[PDB]
């Protein structure tokens, strides 16, 4: 094939693109001793599909009169290789001067001219953090189709970072609203051993205290089935959860971690609970294909509602065919893209097509940049103010208050560079011969539940709540990972409660007696 040649195209304004368009062998994991070129010989289809989405968006924009009339939009794409060094090389090339392979250390950039107008950012949060500082120093507008870490919202450190996938905070807010709706006030929270694994739990624990939910228990779970000591940790976690009298569990972990935990729970039986999933662990094939999943109980989770791109697969097939055509030569950034075969991947992976709405997110990012440029040029339906060349820092002023029409949706960037988005709530009916998912409700900044469609193990809603208030005759004693709720104790006869918020009960004197829950003694 001749396909690596097609990741660059001419135009009046050029978009940069960082994609997971390659990978490196494990031998690269050692400490580098000499600054030689890092090999990235290992193919990645995900990056290919994302780059094709960007190309399709730019082609649509170049054909229509609705955006940027009478001028051509260009691009050139690079592989991040999931490697910070290669990513840094790519970004430094992006900020180099027009027509030159070098970047300037000036003090004043009042007439500097870098070669790209905007950069469509990387697929992972680590590289997003690494590149965002650099890009946002220069006020280069950057748009990420997948970087959900909350830390990226900070406008002080990332003044020019935008994304078209919601932050994790919105998903956890939806979960918290779901917990409030059923008054599932007393909960246990689990996550993976990795950074994301407790970043999620930190955000959830911060959210819970602001709204009442009592995080009774916290912990991390491994994704390493062979690690016997960490399996000891998971056994301890499950015994603790069972001992806590909790009935609802929030589980932010990765798919394999949940698979391990649930398999162990199957074998030693555990007890049924309500498990609340995450975009990471949802529609999980391995988890749903458990031998006897019924021992788990109810399973729920929120999932993003990305719009359709019906023409995408035919576009990919068409362009792979064109890359196979020997005449098309008349028309590396990816070494294996020229080797990879046509049929099986492009068919099967797009039939298997998480991937779909990230493709849509890339498309929407391209459209966001195009609409921002359209506003900045103040284009008419047939005019633009082309007397000047728009510098990147001039887009940034116009990108915060825009709205862009991605396909059928209308979208905006909020004050923190995060898009408005809505979720479906999906629940597992596990009792059919194979488990089935149903859309129990939706979240659009507020939660709507179709109560009539849900199922429960006892045909009645499970409960976990703990008391916070107590009667004037009841002693209060703290419980919870935080001091959020109290289990009331009715003081026994022969003792009295001296005042309604004391934490102990006092015996009566020998000449006196008292009934239960009394505040006083009688002779």
């Amino acid at each position: 094939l001749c396909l690596s040649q097609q990741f660059k195209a001419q135009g009046d304004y050029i978009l940069g693109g960082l994609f997971p368009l390659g990978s490196t062998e494990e031998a690269t994991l050692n400490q580098r001793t000499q600054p030689n070129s890092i090999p990235c010989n290992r193919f990645s289809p995900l990056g290919l599909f994302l780059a094709m989405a960007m190309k399709m968006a730019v082609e649509e924009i170049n054909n229509g009169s609705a955006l940027l009339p009478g001028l051509r939009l260009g691009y050139d794409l690079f592989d991040t290789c999931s490697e910070p060094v290669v990513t840094m090389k790519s970004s430094l090339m992006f900020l180099a001067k027009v027509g030159s392979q070098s970047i300037a250390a000036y003090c004043n950039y009042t007439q500097y001219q870098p070669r790209v107008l905007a950069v469509i950012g990387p697929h992972s949060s680590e590289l997003a953090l690494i590149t965002g500082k650099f890009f946002s120093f220069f006020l280069m507008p950057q748009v990420s189709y997948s970087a959900s870490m909350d830390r990226l919202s900070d406008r002080e450190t990332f003044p020019s970072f935008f994304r078209t996938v919601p932050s994790d905070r919105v998903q956890l807010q939806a979960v918290v609203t779901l917990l409030q709706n059923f008054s599932w006030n007393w909960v246990a929270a689990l996550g993976s051993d990795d950074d994301y694994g407790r970043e999620g739990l930190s955000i959830f624990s911060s959210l819970a205290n602001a709204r009442g939910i009592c995080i009774a228990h916290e912990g991390l779970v491994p994704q390493h089935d062979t690690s016997g000591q960490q399996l000891g940790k998971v056994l301890d976690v499950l015994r603790q959860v069972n001992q806590s009298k909790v009935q609802v569990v929030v589980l932010f972990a990765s798919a394999r971690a949940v698979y391990s935990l649930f398999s162990y729970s199957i074998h030693h039986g555990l007890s049924p609970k309500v498990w609340v999933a995450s975009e990471s662990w949802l529609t999980s094939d391995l988890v749903m294909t458990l031998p006897n999943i019924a021992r788990v109980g109810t399973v729920l989770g929120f999932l993003q509602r990305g719009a359709l791109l019906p023409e995408f697969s035919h576009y990919v097939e068409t362009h792979l065919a064109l890359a196979a055509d020997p005449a098309f030569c008349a028309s590396q950034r990816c070494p294996r893209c020229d080797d990879i075969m046509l049929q099986n991947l492009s068919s099967g992976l797009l039939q298997n097509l998480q991937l779909h709405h990230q493709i849509f997110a890339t498309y929407a990012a391209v459209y966001s940049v195009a609409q921002a440029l359209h506003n900045t040029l103040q284009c008419n339906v047939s005019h633009c103010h082309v007397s000047e060349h728009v510098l990147p820092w001039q887009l940034l002023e116009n990108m915060y208050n825009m709205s862009f029409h991605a396909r059928d949706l209308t979208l905006q960037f909020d004050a923190e560079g995060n898009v408005d988005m809505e979720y479906d709530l999906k629940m597992w009916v596990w009792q059919s011969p194979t488990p089935v998912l149903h859309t129990v409700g939706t979240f659009n900044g507020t939660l709507q539940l179709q109560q009539s469609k849900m199922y429960w193990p006892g045909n009645q809603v499970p409960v976990s709540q703990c008391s916070r208030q107590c009667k004037d005759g009841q002693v209060r004693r703290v419980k919870g990972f935080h001091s959020c709720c109290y289990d009331c104790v009715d003081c026994k006869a022969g003792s009295y409660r001296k005042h309604p918020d004391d934490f102990t009960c006092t015996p009566c004197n020998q000449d006196q007696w008292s009934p239960e829950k009394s505040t006083a003694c009688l002779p």
């Binding site: 580098r32 840094m88 180099a96 250390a105 950039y109 120093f137 450190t157 419980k479």
Partner: protein, 514 residues
């Protein structure tokens, strides 16, 4: 000027001469952020002077780089602001252009090594760039543990122990004096969150319990605060007031504490042990708050003192200037001269490490060096191997990039003409041990050790019953007749006597009975 010294080989230097916790990270009206707006820092200027003195020493010492002139190119980072342009300037060619290339092995950058920033965020941000070229970066005061990852940071080394050792020193100090019950206060930034989380992790396994962990607002000394922030501070101080834990561990910058302690002063709070982290353990400015001495006992974790001869006398292209630094230093001159040179030694040893590595790289003799075009990756390769004594201490980097300097616990003193920061204990990191705990002047009447525990130890034969979350918190209950409590078998439930034995209302063992 003080920031520039031409020579055959140039060291890059990044110091926080001016700092504000809230600042412009990005281009300001499309010009590099102006640093001199953000007040001025005594310790940062002191460390810059330490580097300058080190290079002057090396140029005087004919035995270390004979006939080779060593120079420096010093640029002041501004905490997290002004991080990128200094790196671009250091890596660029003589005409301030940096070419992008596939392979950099033959590329001669302006400087051969960077004496990196004092703070963790800047250190990692700079290391991201410098790993591309494998230009060595020696860091003097960043304690974050993530810097030990040599996959992420192949070119980063340190002349100071890691955060783990500081937290270990804290924990062992608390265990020695039997403080089971403590409070942790953290700043609203990465430093406080990370260090507080690390302390929590290490505390969980050692039998110490935390009353609460509380976040301070990011105020500034010369900034008038809102009523909301004033009420926030009042809330924190009131929560301190009503708590039984009289040991407080503070993970905060110095700037954010000025308002805090002032509040604590006007609230009439007294009688606590304040454990300072190295971020403010030896700050002259906070020490000069003369009435602060009424708030209790002030202890801090810091680097060991290594006196540098001649540095005391020595102390008597945008963002390469400071105006107020000299005037500020002259006022604290006496306190600095009476203080031990603690982090200054990290800076000194970093410069000498670069000097020795370059001395080896040039194949230089006692008498002469064959000057050669140095490419920084070879100098990094050499820096990994240096092994020498500078001032009675062996300077070498462990496989994870740290020099194992001793840590010390210090008590603040407000007498004058003797040391502001007295050394009361010494922590050896290669042994993981706290040792030589000397006399401490407590705030108590007869100088008794101040106590903090959730509850008193039970009487003999008396079983524990837990309360709340904390393992440390328990109440004592008598083992009623017929039951006994050998505390080495269990402490929360009594044993039962054999059929031929009985026990009194509370005892460790039974007696024979019909």
């Amino acid at each position: 000027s003080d920031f520039y010294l031409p020579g055959d080989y140039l060291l890059g230097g990044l110091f926080s001469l001016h700092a504000n916790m809230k600042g412009i990270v990005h281009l300001n009206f499309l010009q590099v952020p102006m640093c001199k707006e953000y007040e001025v820092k005594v310790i940062g200027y002191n460390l810059m002077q330490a580097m300058r003195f080190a290079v002057e020493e090396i140029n005087n010492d004919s035995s270390l780089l004979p006939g080779v002139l060593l120079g420096y190119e010093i640029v002041d980072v501004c905490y997290i602001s002004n991080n990128v342009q200094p790196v671009l300037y250091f890596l660029a060619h003589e005409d301030n252009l940096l070419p992008i290339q596939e392979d950099y092995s033959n590329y001669s950058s302006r400087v051969v090594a960077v004496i990196g920033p004092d703070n963790s965020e800047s250190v990692m941000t700079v290391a991201n760039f410098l790993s591309l070229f494998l230009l060595p970066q020696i860091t003097y005061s960043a304690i974050s543990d993530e810097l030990r990852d040599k996959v992420r940071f192949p070119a980063l080394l340190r002349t100071t122990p890691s955060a783990d050792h500081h937290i270990e020193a804290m924990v062992q100090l608390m265990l020695h004096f039997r403080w089971n019950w403590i409070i942790v206060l953290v700043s609203n930034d990465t430093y406080g969150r990370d260090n507080g989380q690390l302390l929590g992790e290490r505390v969980a396994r050692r039998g110490i319990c935390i009353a609460f962990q509380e976040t301070l607002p990011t105020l500034q000394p010369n900034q008038n605060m809102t009523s909301e922030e004033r009420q926030r501070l009042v809330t924190i101080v009131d929560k301190l007031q009503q708590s039984t834990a009289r040991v407080v561990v503070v993970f905060s910058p110095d700037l954010t504490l000025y308002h805090f302690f002032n509040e604590v002063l006007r609230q009439n709070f007294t009688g606590a042990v304040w454990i300072a982290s190295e971020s403010w353990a030896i700050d002259p400015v906070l020490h000069n708050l003369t009435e602060l001495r009424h708030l209790g006992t002030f202890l801090g974790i810091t680097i060991q003192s290594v006196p540098i001869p001649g540095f005391s006398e020595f102390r008597e292209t945008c963002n390469q200037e400071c105006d107020n630094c000299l005037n500020a230093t002259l006022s604290f001159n006496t306190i600095l001269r009476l203080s031990g040179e603690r982090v200054v030694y990290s800076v000194y040893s970093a410069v000498y490490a670069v000097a020795h590595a370059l001395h080896s790289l040039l194949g230089c003799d006692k008498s002469t060096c064959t000057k050669r075009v140095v490419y920084p990756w070879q100098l990094l390769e050499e820096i990994w191997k240096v092994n020498f004594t500078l001032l009675d201490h062996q300077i070498f980097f462990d496989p994870q990039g740290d020099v194992a300097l001793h840590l010390e616990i210090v008590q603040w003193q407000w007498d004058r003409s003797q040391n502001p920061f007295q050394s009361v204990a010494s922590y050896y990191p290669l042994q993981r041990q706290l040792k030589n705990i000397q006399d401490i002047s407590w705030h108590t009447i007869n100088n008794t050790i101040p106590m903090s525990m959730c509850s008193k130890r039970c009487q003999s034969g008396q079983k524990k019953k837990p309360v709340g979350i904390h393992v440390c918190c328990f109440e004592c209950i008598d083992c009623l007749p017929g039951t006994f409590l050998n505390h080495t078998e269990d402490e929360y439930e009594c044993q039962a006597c054999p059929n031929n034995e009985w026990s009194y209302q509370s005892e460790t063992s039974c007696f024979k009975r019909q």
